[PDB]
Scaffold this motif. Structure first.
Motif, PDB file in Angstrom:
ATOM      1  N   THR A 109       0.173  -3.033  11.447  1.00 44.09           N
ATOM      2  CA  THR A 109      -0.108  -1.632  11.717  1.00 44.09           C
ATOM      3  C   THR A 109       1.198  -0.876  11.909  1.00 44.09           C
ATOM      4  N   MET A 110       1.194   0.405  11.541  1.00 44.70           N
ATOM      5  CA  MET A 110       2.399   1.216  11.634  1.00 44.70           C
ATOM      6  C   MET A 110       2.029   2.681  11.829  1.00 44.70           C
ATOM      7  N   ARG A 111       2.981   3.436  12.376  1.00 46.00           N
ATOM      8  CA  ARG A 111       2.819   4.867  12.606  1.00 46.00           C
ATOM      9  C   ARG A 111       3.475   5.630  11.462  1.00 46.00           C
ATOM     10  N   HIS A 141       7.910   6.038  11.083  1.00 45.44           N
ATOM     11  CA  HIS A 141       8.725   6.339  12.249  1.00 45.44           C
ATOM     12  C   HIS A 141       9.520   5.111  12.667  1.00 45.44           C
ATOM     13  N   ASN A 199       8.360   1.392  14.227  1.00 48.91           N
ATOM     14  CA  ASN A 199       7.057   1.545  14.873  1.00 48.91           C
ATOM     15  C   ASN A 199       6.020   0.728  14.103  1.00 48.91           C
ATOM     16  N   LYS A 200       6.186  -0.591  14.163  1.00 42.09           N
ATOM     17  CA  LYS A 200       5.346  -1.513  13.414  1.00 42.09           C
ATOM     18  C   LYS A 200       4.842  -2.625  14.321  1.00 42.09           C
ATOM     19  N   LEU A 201       3.566  -2.956  14.161  1.00 37.40           N
ATOM     20  CA  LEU A 201       2.877  -3.940  14.984  1.00 37.40           C
ATOM     21  C   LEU A 201       2.460  -5.102  14.098  1.00 37.40           C
ATOM     22  N   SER A 237       7.072  11.542   3.271  1.00 41.54           N
ATOM     23  CA  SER A 237       6.481  10.816   4.385  1.00 41.54           C
ATOM     24  C   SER A 237       7.578  10.181   5.223  1.00 41.54           C
ATOM     25  N   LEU A 271      -2.760  -9.098  11.214  1.00 39.62           N
ATOM     26  CA  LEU A 271      -3.040  -7.693  11.469  1.00 39.62           C
ATOM     27  C   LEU A 271      -1.706  -6.972  11.550  1.00 39.62           C
ATOM     28  N   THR A 302       0.826  -1.201   0.000  1.00 42.09           N
ATOM     29  CA  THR A 302       0.000   0.000   0.000  1.00 42.09           C
ATOM     30  C   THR A 302       0.863   1.255   0.000  1.00 42.09           C
ATOM     31  N   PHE A 303       0.467   2.225  -0.822  1.00 41.95           N
ATOM     32  CA  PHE A 303       1.129   3.517  -0.892  1.00 41.95           C
ATOM     33  C   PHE A 303       0.068   4.601  -1.015  1.00 41.95           C
ATOM     34  N   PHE A 304       0.457   5.827  -0.677  1.00 37.53           N
ATOM     35  CA  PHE A 304      -0.446   6.971  -0.695  1.00 37.53           C
ATOM     36  C   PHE A 304      -0.188   7.787  -1.955  1.00 37.53           C
ATOM     37  N   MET A 331      12.131   5.030  15.275  1.00 38.59           N
ATOM     38  CA  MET A 331      12.853   5.316  16.512  1.00 38.59           C
ATOM     39  C   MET A 331      12.671   4.172  17.500  1.00 38.59           C
ATOM     40  N   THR A 332      13.773   3.715  18.099  1.00 40.54           N
ATOM     41  CA  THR A 332      13.711   2.633  19.076  1.00 40.54           C
ATOM     42  C   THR A 332      12.968   1.446  18.478  1.00 40.54           C
ATOM     43  N   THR A 333      13.552   0.825  17.458  1.00 39.45           N
ATOM     44  CA  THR A 333      12.915  -0.231  16.680  1.00 39.45           C
ATOM     45  C   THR A 333      11.839   0.384  15.792  1.00 39.45           C
TER      46      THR A 333
END
Ligand SMILES: *[C@@H]1O[C@H](CO)[C@@H](O[C@@H]2O[C@H](CO)[C@@H](O[C@@H]3O[C@H](CO[C@H]4O[C@H](CO)[C@@H](O)[C@H](O[C@H]5O[C@H](CO)[C@@H](O)[C@H](O)[C@@H]5O)[C@@H]4O)[C@@H](O)[C@H](O[C@H]4O[C@H](CO)[C@@H](O)[C@H](O)[C@@H]4O)[C@@H]3O)[C@H](O)[C@H]2NC(C)=O)[C@H](O)[C@H]1NC(C)=O
Ligand SMILES: *[C@@H]1O[C@H](CO)[C@@H](O[C@@H]2O[C@H](CO)[C@@H](O[C@@H]3O[C@H](CO[C@H]4O[C@H](CO)[C@@H](O)[C@H](O[C@H]5O[C@H](CO)[C@@H](O)[C@H](O)[C@@H]5O)[C@@H]4O)[C@@H](O)[C@H](O[C@H]4O[C@H](CO)[C@@H](O)[C@H](O)[C@@H]4O)[C@@H]3O)[C@H](O)[C@H]2NC(C)=O)[C@H](O)[C@H]1NC(C)=O
Ligand SMILES: *[C@@H]1O[C@H](CO)[C@@H](O[C@@H]2O[C@H](CO)[C@@H](O[C@@H]3O[C@H](CO)[C@@H](O)[C@H](O)[C@@H]3O)[C@H](O)[C@H]2NC(C)=O)[C@H](O)[C@H]1NC(C)=O
Ligand SMILES: *[C@@H]1O[C@H](CO)[C@@H](O[C@@H]2O[C@H](CO)[C@@H](O[C@@H]3O[C@H](CO)[C@@H](O)[C@H](O)[C@@H]3O)[C@H](O)[C@H]2NC(C)=O)[C@H](O)[C@H]1NC(C)=O
Ligand SMILES: *[C@@H]1O[C@H](CO)[C@@H](O[C@@H]2O[C@H](CO)[C@@H](O[C@@H]3O[C@H](CO)[C@@H](O)[C@H](O)[C@@H]3O)[C@H](O)[C@H]2NC(C)=O)[C@H](O)[C@H]1NC(C)=O
Ligand SMILES: *[C@@H]1O[C@H](CO)[C@@H](O[C@@H]2O[C@H](CO)[C@@H](O)[C@H](O)[C@H]2NC(C)=O)[C@H](O)[C@H]1NC(C)=O
Lengths: 257, 264, 247, 120, 207, 120, 120
Positions: free
Chosen positions: A40-42, A20, A26-28, A17, A38, A9-11, A22-24
């Motif tokens: 998810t990312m910031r 993020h 930011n992906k779930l 863009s 599932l 997926t892209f915007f 930082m500190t690993t």
């Protein structure tokens, strides 16, 4: 996540863009018994938003956010809002990081598109924005109105006080010139006049007519000496009245537009 | 340090040594009494918490010479993992009191992937968990206090642990006294010279009054470029508009006297 | 059912023994890389910087016999990491100043294979490109400047470029909008250029820009004219008032 | 360099100690108070920062003592409110460099005052 | 191109195709008369010189669609290696004659790690070794001359090979006439109008 | 497009040739001179740049020839000295695009002149 | 080229050496002094920066010799003060470019003086 397959997926609107990191990253990533993923990312997204500026300080817009698969066409990958359309985009109650805009709401939908590489399905979200007029009132409109009134006070000075009347007219014309110059810094180089340009131009017309009035009276007091003082007596009320009616029309227009 | 605070950006830049501390029973070792300290590159070979800063706009781990990380193991398997981080964090500001304002900027620490069922956060040493607040040297602000908080935050995907670090920043007014308020007062006083000039020297009266009004307008318009175009009146805006009213009436006064003198 | 394993082993058989180092038909005739561009938008056009910024979808087609497969009829789309496992042309923009491929969630690359071995390779790129301007007539000028597309290492005897689809090869340019400028015309050109190291292929994309005069009327000419007319008021002020006439 | 001199010593209750600094104090933004007595290591008491006013106190004196400053006089004060017998010690005023380490460790302080004995 | 020369930062920005030639007998091959133009990703698998620019404030190698590099192996073992680089380089300027000055910027090229005992640099082709100086589009300056230098420069760690490329710039006076001297001359001329206004007009002559 | 008109050909010593240009010359900042002796391939001679003034030459004519331009008249001048028979050929004047390749290769030049003859 | 000349050499104690420079010295911001006794290698002595004033010395002459300059005269001076018998040598005044390497190595200095003598 680097070992598993994930959608590309892209915007479409993205100018620049950040995912993020930082500190690993930011992906779930969560994986259910039945194989459901599932993921998810910031993200910080700077999205290209087209908008029209005819009503510049009093405008309303709907900035779009469009996204979908980059490589996989309509016949391979399709996107669906997870919990229905209305329930799928959620705005944090404290998320209004807007200074001059008030987010009226958002509407979300879907599109098919056709491209040189095949068909694709696009998810769409439009965020409705309405500008808050308060800043420009004190920054531009009150300065303009004060200048227009500041020109007309010179009508109460006696006709023979040539230097005083001259300096009123000149200084107020310069004030309007610099107000016009500075107002242009608030926008890109749009090639058409906005509402604030109309207001500035009309106030400028009143200022320059105030100067022309003194020029006319100074000409006639020498050329045909007197009743010429009725020019002052008339302008002294006509200019305020006409400027007032101008405002009563302008604001009545753009508050209902 | 807190490096800079910006109203136009509604953010601040924070540099910190950030450390984390947890047990990993798999890393317990015996026969060695020392606390093993290892090269930071072991950090890519170990599990570490998914800790992140929710209101971070832009941040990076320092990388000169070698990436600024530390890992120190202990016999019981507890891991001390430390980073040096610079982060630019969002801080929305209420400028209605500006420049007499004070602001509550915060850093929101959270675990991203793991819910409260998998991760728990706590401040080591309680209120003494944060140090170095004494060595912040912002010109514009003095830190009245700092506060530590712990919470659970609920999303549609679960409940997550949060830790929050807050600062109460109160602005130093001396800069604005020297640069903005005093010049406004002086220009306002300059207006009152008008009433000492004889009333038949119309050119001088008018020149001085109109100069005062113009200078006040320029003072008004210059300042708002230095700070966000927020749609309400600030304290300094009210002050400058009052001074504008005074200097404007100090020219309507000349109009009155001249009309009464030369015409009525 | 068994298709998944079948296609997995097909792709593995294609990649097994594949050499990244060698272009298709190395030593043989040059490979023909057909290109398409879909203009997303043109960002700021800067006279002060003598450049413009462009965002586009950039696609390349070529045939590599090493990637032919027969058991699967599909036009096979693969995860973009495959691009690091395949030979791809070294096309570069000769007049760019700063550019990057987008990575909003994953790096914006595309790899789609076809049974006959043709590879479709796609990128989404934002590029700031040098654009020299003849300001001798500004603001009543019209400017032409281009995007220059060339292969960095391979000469014309190794690669040939061509616009895939002829004059229809570029899209979007007929629809973009700019504040200062409007696109009068765009041209697609292909040629080769000669250096001491050899002759290299090239494609060139050109835009001709007509300036929108309104903004400069609002900015420059109005205040200048109206200051000039302001000065003529002196000729009507009585010539005994030295203070006013001079002021 | 920076020179420190202290006053307010002697047998005691309530008391105030004072520290006067001269020289290049800008290089030494933080001033700290330390105390020592026979048979024991030097203790951290509290600290003050020039031009910031922030303070931190050892838990042994927290809510009893307070430290304050006069930036124009270049003096630092420690309010010995509610003394107790165990407070007997020589109290040292010291300066800390801008990029020295933690507050609580005497080794981080460069310039040291003469120190005032107190008796309780 | 030289993108810009700036006095406010005492630097200039330069873009170039940087080429290097050396012989590595380990890469000699037979049975193929051709020159092996391999994919640029080979460069990560070979030894390449550590050349760096002494006075660059920062630099980067262009990367879109591929990292812009070239590898070409000749049968006798000669390696041709090249890449497109944009560099922002320091250039101290003597502004004591500002509108009519003549500045001298340079690019200094050196091996970071290997000393003269291990590496030697030379301009391939002598004075022919640099091209593209004809296509500099500087509005503020014009390239009067360029010439090339080669020398060994010695440090405590050893003597190092160095090459340097130099540009002599002469400023285009045209801009400063229109925007500093015409205003200055005109305002000075306008000031003498006071001598033609009658002496009794105190307000006019003072204003 | 751009048009080039040449002049100055014929039998010679020292001599000058001229090459005026018209059209959209802003897109072609470099003008080059070439020559082609009878029965031989075309040769590079020299080049000059609009608004730049920098010049480069074939090694065989360096210090023998010179080249200069007039940017208001939109013409380029090539000057010759110590003329001898090996220099005889039909001389050409041509324009190069902004982003075309190296100078010495005529394939990069898009517009060409009439090809004045020179003899001695 | 930048040119250098020297004066003041001779049998001395205390003594003064004078060195004068001309040309585009802005390119060569650092001056230096060197010497060699008969049969020995060329030793470093000291250096001075134009318009910066920074100086560095060889420890064999530290605190005995001092180097000074005059920007208007474009001269550099070395104080042969507190002279010792070991100092007898021909002294060279030299200049160094901006980006040349270490100051202590004569190979980095491009233009050289006459090599005036000193004796005792
Ligand atoms: C900057 O601005 C931010 C935002 O305004 C400030 O952050 C707030 O700080 C305060 C402290 O000053 C925080 O309050 C503390 O929060 C915790 C956590 O409480 C939560 O979790 C509990 C456990 O599950 C839960 O029970 C709580 O809910 C109950 O309590 C609240 C009390 O407000 C009540 O409203 C609810 O209905 C529930 O009954 C809650 O979800 C907690 O540990 C603290 O409790 C202490 O104080 C209370 C006071 O009544 C006392 O009863 C306790 O015994 C204990 O002493 C305390 O409530 C608050 O959570 C922060 N808010 C946010 C949004 O982060 C920040 O302080 C500002 N900084 C500066 C420097 O100015
Ligand atoms: C913006 O500005 C740029 C730069 O100025 C403009 O770019 C120019 O566009 C034009 C087209 O509008 C280009 O000319 C075309 O180029 C091709 C290629 O010619 C070359 O390659 C051929 C082989 O592929 C070769 O035959 C050519 O040599 C012949 O032609 C030259 C030139 O006439 C002549 O000197 C030779 O003797 C040969 O006769 C050459 O090497 C060409 O195909 C086009 O048509 C001509 O050529 C064909 C035969 O090839 C012939 O059949 C046609 O009738 C016609 O004669 C045409 O010349 C030009 O090269 C571009 N300039 C640069 C520097 O690249 C751009 O147009 C502007 N854009 C806008 C929107 O304003
Ligand atoms: C975000 O953080 C990551 C992790 O710290 C940054 O480092 C990148 O991490 C990856 C692995 O997760 C590295 O991959 C490399 O891959 C190959 C094998 O495919 C191997 O040769 C290397 O050993 C390495 O593992 C990657 O190199 C590394 N990148 C850098 C520049 O160090 C990552 O860069 C951060 N930022 C982003 C935007 O991802
Ligand atoms: C390895 O590191 C651990 C810490 O991770 C060290 O253990 C700690 O040792 C200190 C003394 O050096 C102990 O401090 C004492 O604690 C009590 C309060 O708990 C107090 O009475 C004393 O004043 C003193 O401070 C500390 O408790 C102990 N544990 C922890 C968790 O800190 C250990 O010494 C290190 N070992 C080596 C070999 O370096
Ligand atoms: C896989 O991709 C290929 C790409 O070439 C697809 O080939 C398509 O084949 C059809 C049939 O020949 C082409 O149709 C064209 O249509 C018009 C008439 O409508 C006519 O002008 C042409 O002669 C031509 O036949 C089509 O252009 C071509 N390409 C595309 C993008 O459709 C093929 O269909 C794909 N296969 C699958 C299973 O998706
Ligand atoms: C987008 O394209 C898809 C292609 O599948 C469309 O889905 C079809 O919709 C029609 C009705 O319009 C149904 O009869 C078909 O069965 C659907 N096909 C599939 C595979 O689901 C979809 O309607 C299109 N949407 C829009 C908004 O154009």
């Amino acid at each position: 996540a680097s070992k598993i397959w994930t959608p590309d997926t892209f915007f479409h609107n993205g100018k620049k863009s950040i995912a993020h990191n930082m500190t690993t990253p930011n992906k779930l990533l969560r994986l259910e018994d039945d194989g459901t993923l599932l993921y998810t990312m910031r993200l910080t997204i700077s999205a290209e938003c087209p908008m029209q500026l005819e009503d510049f300080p009093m405008d309303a817009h709907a900035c779009p956010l469009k996204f979908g698969s980059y490589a996989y066409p309509n016949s391979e990958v399709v996107y669906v809002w997870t919990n229905g359309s209305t329930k799928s985009v959620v705005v944090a109650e404290d998320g209004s990081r807007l200074n001059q805009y008030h987010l009226m709401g958002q509407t979300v939908g879907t599109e098919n598109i056709s491209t040189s590489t095949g068909e694709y399905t696009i998810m769409t979200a439009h965020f409705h924005l309405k500008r808050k007029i308060g800043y420009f009132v004190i920054q531009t409109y009150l300065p303009c109105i004060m200048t227009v009134i500041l020109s007309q006070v010179s009508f109460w000075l006696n006709r023979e006080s040539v230097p005083a009347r001259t300096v009123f007219g000149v200084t107020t014309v310069l004030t309007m010139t610099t107000l016009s110059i500075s107002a242009r810094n608030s926008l890109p180089k749009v090639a058409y006049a906005t509402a604030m340009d109309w207001f500035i131009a009309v106030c400028y017309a009143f200022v320059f007519s105030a100067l022309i009035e003194f020029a006319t009276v100074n000409y006639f007091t020498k050329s045909q000496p007197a009743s010429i003082s009725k020019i002052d007596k008339m302008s002294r009320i006509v200019f305020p009245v006409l400027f007032g009616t101008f405002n009563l029309v302008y604001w009545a227009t753009y508050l209902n537009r | 340090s807190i490096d800079m605070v910006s109203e136009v950006n509604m953010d601040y830049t924070l540099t910190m040594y950030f450390q984390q501390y947890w047990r990993d029973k798999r890393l317990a070792y015996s026969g060695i009494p020392l606390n093993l300290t290892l090269d930071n590159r072991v950090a890519d070979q170990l599990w570490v918490p998914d800790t992140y800063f929710l209101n971070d706009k832009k941040s990076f781990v320092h990388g000169v010479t070698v990436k600024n990380r530390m890992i120190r193991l202990h016999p019981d398997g507890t891991v001390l993992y430390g980073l040096r981080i610079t982060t630019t964090a969002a801080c929305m500001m209420d400028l209605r009191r500006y420049p007499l304002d004070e602001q509550n900027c915060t850093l929101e620490i959270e675990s991203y992937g793991y819910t409260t069922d998998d991760i728990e956060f706590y401040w080591r040493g309680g209120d003494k968990a944060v140090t170095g607040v004494e060595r912040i040297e912002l010109p514009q602000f003095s830190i009245v206090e700092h506060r530590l908080v712990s919470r659970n935050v609920v999303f549609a995907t679960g409940a997550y642990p949060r830790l929050s670090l807050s600062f109460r920043l109160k602005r130093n007014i001396g800069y604005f006294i020297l640069q903005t308020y005093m010049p406004s007062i002086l220009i306002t006083i300059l207006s009152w010279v008008s009433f000492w000039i004889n009333y038949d020297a119309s050119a001088a009266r008018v020149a001085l009054g109109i100069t005062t009004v113009l200078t006040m307008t320029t003072i008004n318009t210059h300042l708002r470029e230095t700070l966000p175009k927020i749609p309400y009146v600030k304290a300094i805006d009210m002050y400058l508009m009052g001074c504008f009213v005074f200097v404007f009436l100090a020219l309507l006064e000349y109009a009155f006297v001249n009309y009464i003198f030369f015409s009525q | 059912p068994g298709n998944m394993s079948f296609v997995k082993e097909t792709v593995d058989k294609l990649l097994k023994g594949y050499d990244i180092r060698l272009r298709p038909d190395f030593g043989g005739p040059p490979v023909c890389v057909g290109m398409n561009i879909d203009i997303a938008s043109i960002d700021m056009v800067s006279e002060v910087n003598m450049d413009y910024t462009l965002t586009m979808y950039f696609q390349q087609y070529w045939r590599d016999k090493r990637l032919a497969y027969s058991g699967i009829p599909l036009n096979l789309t693969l995860d973009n990491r495959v691009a690091d496992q395949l030979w791809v042309p070294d096309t570069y923009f000769l007049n760019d100043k700063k550019s990057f491929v987008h990575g909003v969630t994953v790096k914006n690359r595309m790899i789609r294979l076809h049974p006959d071995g043709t590879v479709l390779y796609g990128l989404r790129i934002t590029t700031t490109a040098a654009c020299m301007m003849d300001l001798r007539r500004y603001p009543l000028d019209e400017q032409n400047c281009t995007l220059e597309i060339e292969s960095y290492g391979y000469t014309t005897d190794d690669i040939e470029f061509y616009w895939r689809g002829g004059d229809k090869a570029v899209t979007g340019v007929e629809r973009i909008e700019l504040p200062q400028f409007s696109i009068v015309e765009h041209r697609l050109v292909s040629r080769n250029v000669v250096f001491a190291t050899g002759a290299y292929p090239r494609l060139s994309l050109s835009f001709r820009l007509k300036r929108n005069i309104g903004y400069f009327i609002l900015q420059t000419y109005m205040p200048s004219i109206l200051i000039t007319i302001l000065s003529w008021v002196s000729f009507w002020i009585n010539y005994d008032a030295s203070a006013a006439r001079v002021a | 360099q920076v020179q420190l001199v202290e006053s307010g010593g002697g047998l005691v209750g309530s008391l105030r100690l004072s520290c006067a600094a001269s020289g290049h104090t800008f290089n030494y933004p933080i001033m700290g108070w330390f105390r020592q007595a026979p048979g024991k290591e030097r203790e951290f008491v509290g600290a003050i920062s020039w031009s910031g006013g922030s303070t931190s106190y050892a838990d042994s004196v927290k809510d009893r003592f307070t430290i304050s400053r006069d930036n124009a006089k270049n003096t630092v004060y420690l309010e010995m409110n509610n003394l107790k017998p165990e407070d007997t010690a020589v109290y040292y005023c010291a300066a800390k460099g801008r990029y020295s380490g933690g507050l609580y460790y005497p080794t981080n302080y460069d310039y040291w005052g003469q120190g005032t004995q107190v008796t309780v």
